[PDB]
Amino acid sequence: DISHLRVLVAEDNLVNQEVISRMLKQEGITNLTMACNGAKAIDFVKESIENNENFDLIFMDVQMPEVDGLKATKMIRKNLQYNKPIIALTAFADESNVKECLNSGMSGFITKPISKTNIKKVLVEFLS
Ligand SMILES: [Mg+2]
C-alpha cells in the first residue's frame, strides 16, 4: 500500500544507494530517484515540482561533494519551497552538527548504517 510514494535518495556512496534502494523496494516503493550530490538533488526536486511528479519524501545524506546535504536542504526548503519530509542520513550525530542539521531544515535523521526498521518507522510517522 505504499507504491503511491515517490522518493528521492541523495547519497554520494553508490554501494549505499543500492542498499537503501533494495530496502525501499522491499517495503513496496516502485518510484525511486537517486542523486549523487546536493546539486543533483536540487535539480531533481525543481523538476518534480514543475512536472507534478512531486517527491513525497527525501532521504538526504549530510556529507556529499560539490553541494552537501545541508546546503541542498536549505535550497530545497527556501528556494524551491519544498515543505515535505527530508530525513538526514548521518554517519555521526553530535550536539553541534545536529543543531546545524535542524537549522538547515531537516525533518529528522537516521544514523548510518540504516536498517529496514528505520525506513518503516519514517513511513508510518511521516507518511500515514
Ligand atoms: Mg556521503
Numbering used by the authors: 1240 to 1367
Copy the relevant paper text.
If the HK incorporates a REC domain (REC-1) is denoted as hybrid histidine kinase (hHK), and the first His-Asp phosphotransfer event occurs in the same polypeptide chain. Then, HPt protein containing a phosphorylatable His shuffles the phosphoryl group from the phosphorylatable Asp in the REC-1 domain to the phosphorylatable Asp in the REC domain of an RR (REC-2) in two more phosphotransfer steps. In fungi, the HPt accepts the phosphoryl group from REC-1 domains of various hHKs upstream of the signaling pathway and forwards it downstream to REC-2 domains present in at least two conserved RRs, Ssk1 and Skn7. Also, we have obtained the crystal structures of Ct_HPt alone and in complex with REChHK6 bound to the phosphomimetic BeF3−, as well as the crystal structures of REChHK3 and RECCa_Sln1.
Motivated by our findings and to analyze the Leu-Thr switch in another fungus, we set up crystallization trials with the REC-1 domain of C. albicans (RECCal_Sln1) in the presence of phosphomimetic, either isolated or together with Cal_Ypd1. We obtained crystals for RECCal_Sln1 isolated which contained four molecules in the AU. Again, the molecules did not contain phosphomimetic in the active center, but contained a Mg2+ ion bound stabilized by interactions with the phosphorylatable D1300, residue D1251 in loop β1–α1, main chain carbonyl oxygen of Q1302 in loop β3–α3 and three water molecules. Also, the overall structure was similar to REChHK6 (rmsd of 0.7 Å in 115 residues), but, the loop β4–α4 was ordered and well defined although its conformation slightly differed from REChHK6, as well as the position of α4. The structure of RECCal_Sln1 also provided two interesting features. On one side, the N-terminal H1243 in one molecule was located at a close distance (<6–8 Å) of the phosphorylatable D1300 in another neighbor molecule, however, the distance was not close enough to stabilize the phosphomimetic as it does a catalytic His. On another side, we observed that a Cys in α4 (C1340), which is conserved in the REC-1 domains studied, was connected to a large electron density that may account for a posttranslational modification that we could not identify unambiguously, despite the high resolution of the electron density map (1.5 Å). We also analyzed the active center of RECCal_Sln1 and, as expected, in the absence of phosphomimetic, the OLeu-NAsp+1 distance between Leu in β4 (L1328) and Asp + 1 in β3 corresponds to a hydrogen bond (~3 Å). In this way, all four molecules of RECCal_Sln1 lack the Leu-Thr switch so Thr in β4 (T1329) and Phe in β5 (F1348) were oriented away from the active center. Interestingly, according to the PISA server RECCal_Sln1 also formed two dimers in the crystal (buried area of ~1800 Å2 and ΔGdiss of ~6 kcal/mol).
